[PDB]
């Protein structure tokens, strides 16, 4: 499992002057993905007479 940053998002605008205030903007986003591991198998046989 691993993290990912979807987007940083915008934080803070070009506010005017003489304005005792500020703006909260818009926070980013962090997702948390994950993944498996798959197996691969097989089988094979002989007759032990021609093998000998």
């Amino acid at each position: 499992t691993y993290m990912k940053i979807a987007d940083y998002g915008q934080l803070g605008e070009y506010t005017c002057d003489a304005k005792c205030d500020a703006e909260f903007g818009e926070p980013g986003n962090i997702r948390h993905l994950e993944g498996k591991t798959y197996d691969y198998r097989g089988v094979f046989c002989f007759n032990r007479k021609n093998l000998q």
């Binding site: 089988v43 094979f44 046989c45 002989f46 007759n47 021609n50």
Partner: protein, 87 residues
């Protein structure tokens, strides 16, 4: 008369003596197939008898190493000819 026979052969001997149970006619090539042989092969019999010598030099060997549906045992070797007389 003029019967035709397809029959399996069970090899016998270190020189490869094949005994047929019906004495092929006279000069028609009796044909051996299966048994790992890549292609059917023909041989002339001796007139009146039913003993053949398998050529030690084998033409092909279509082996099938590794298989779990039949344990690649073998396909058995057959032989095909015609017997009896004409008239």
């Amino acid at each position: 008369p003029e019967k035709t026979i397809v029959e399996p052969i069970r090899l016998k001997g270190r020189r490869g003596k094949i005994i047929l149970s019906a004495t092929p006619i006279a000069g028609r090539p009796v044909v051996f197939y299966g048994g790992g042989l890549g292609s059917p092969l023909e041989l002339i019999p001796r007139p009146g008898s039913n003993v053949l010598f398998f050529p030690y030099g084998s033409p092909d060997r279509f082996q099938t190493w590794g298989d779990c549906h039949t344990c690649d045992v073998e396909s058995q070797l057959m032989a095909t000819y015609v017997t009896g007389r004409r008239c």
